[PDB]
Amino acid sequence: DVYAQEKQDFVQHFSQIVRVLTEHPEIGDAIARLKEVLEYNTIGGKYNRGLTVVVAFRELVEPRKQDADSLQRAWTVGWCVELLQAFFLVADDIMDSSLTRRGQICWYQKPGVGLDAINDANLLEACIYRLLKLYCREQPYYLNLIELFLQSSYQTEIGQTLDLLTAPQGNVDLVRFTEKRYKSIVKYGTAFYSFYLPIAAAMYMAGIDGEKEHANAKKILLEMGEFFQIQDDYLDLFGDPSVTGKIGTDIQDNKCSWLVVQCLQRATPEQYQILKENYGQKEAEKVARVKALYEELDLPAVFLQYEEDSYSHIMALIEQYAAPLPPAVFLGLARKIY
């Protein structure tokens, strides 16, 4: 894989990221807490989002212009994307009352952390702009990158807002769980930061700043992002936690999941009442009841049929909109998620 070939170097750059962010002795204790937050949260993942920056940079920039300093900036912008995601996940885990993430207990669930994690999450976000300034201040794409990361934060936060509004705690209303709402949540909430942001960063780094090029790129990447969140919802309930590294909470959290949307599209009036009585509640028995209904409506086969249809749809979109970028930029990402 083109990701496996660049992974080792990317992960080894993390030490430099941390050292640079850790180097006024009065704030030494705060800096040690930042190091602890960085090391706990921005490490233990697959680093696919950050790697997508590095890989896309190598495919878009002329090898002659891929010098030691330009590669360093690519690895740094890659780590900036991982830091953005670390910021969102630390905060999303509090708001979703999650237990584990990347095989360990959620940072806020750690004794002595608690709601202090809210500030820790904001520090991770601040670190992006610290790194963009330290490594890209003198580059012509500097402001493009600042604006792209700020826009990515706004889009995700709007998406998280739709997510929380559609999922009110202890307010069970399935009328809100529609396909139109679902696609809107995921587009803003996941698709921009997970797929548009990494490729767009490498594009700007390669001097590709044209609105039309970014629009064409966005058409493919937002559609891949939608499949990716549908996969995330599927794995929340039917995935193996020893593989996902996290425990699913969508049913207990009354989330507008792809699965509840598909359940509602296929449920008889009798099945609708079962779901109405058991969804969005903490009881193990009620959550087990919902999973049984999903299994009875054969949603895992519906997801597998969707994964196939989605893949063929995204491939058709790469054929239509990849030009003038190398199709490999999008094919490498499509192989990693499908």
Added chain:
Amino acid sequence: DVYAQEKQDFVQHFSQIVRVLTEHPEIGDAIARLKEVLEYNTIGGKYNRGLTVVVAFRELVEPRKQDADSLQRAWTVGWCVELLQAFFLVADDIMDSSLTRRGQICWYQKPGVGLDAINDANLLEACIYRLLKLYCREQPYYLNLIELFLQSSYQTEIGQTLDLLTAPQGNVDLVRFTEKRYKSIVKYGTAFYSFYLPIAAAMYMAGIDGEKEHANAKKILLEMGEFFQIQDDYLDLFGDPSVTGKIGTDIQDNKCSWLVVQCLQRATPEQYQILKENYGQKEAEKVARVKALYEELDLPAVFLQYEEDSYSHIMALIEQYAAPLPPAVFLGLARKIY
């Protein structure tokens, strides 16, 4: 007052700020939640930080260059400072387990809000960069302002980190509460965003971007910021909530307050044990015991003597470092806080 003369216009500009931030129908519900967050949080205060931008702009820019569009940008950057503070306070109220703010219950304490306020706080932060782009994108000071707001967030977050580390819940250790630590907390945590940020924004807007000018300005403004946080700590316990609009929690929160620092400097071994047994705990009786010790050590008179010494010290600093800026830029702010 130079603030009273510009207040009405500034507060009336809020409607335009909200309309511009509220104007893709799919995200309509999220936008209505953003409007609710803006209206609840960025309104009910004294708006002194945002007003400081407007007033300083008028004193630094040549009246001939103070056209309709430039004034609009000044009111917008002023509202951006209020939005930064709204972001910090919504999150600080969760982390400090506060009850009220600006005469109403804390946004997170509202039924149906809760930990969703974490995302609401991030949306308020995102709104700054939305406004800076909509109104200052074509201005030569655009990047200066972006960097100044991002640096302000980082500084405050580092300061909040020192604050939370020095105040561990249920871990009563007075050994941490030193004057060196106190000054470090407040400098990063309050002084940069409250006093440096507003004047620096107006300076950049007036084309004053010189490092030496910003350094001289910072020397006065960080010292004013220190007095202001000392005043905030004093009012936390001895202020009138019907005037402050908020209930104090520093004693129950085990905070490194200016008052606990002064108590420790003057306490006998016997008085140290009383404080050790009663500080950083929820019991009304224990909090009453701490306030009695502060009254016995005559800390309100120590604060009044400090307010006098501080004022004379800041005035001496305006004489030394105000040039070439009009001393009125700093005198107007000193009258508002002293």
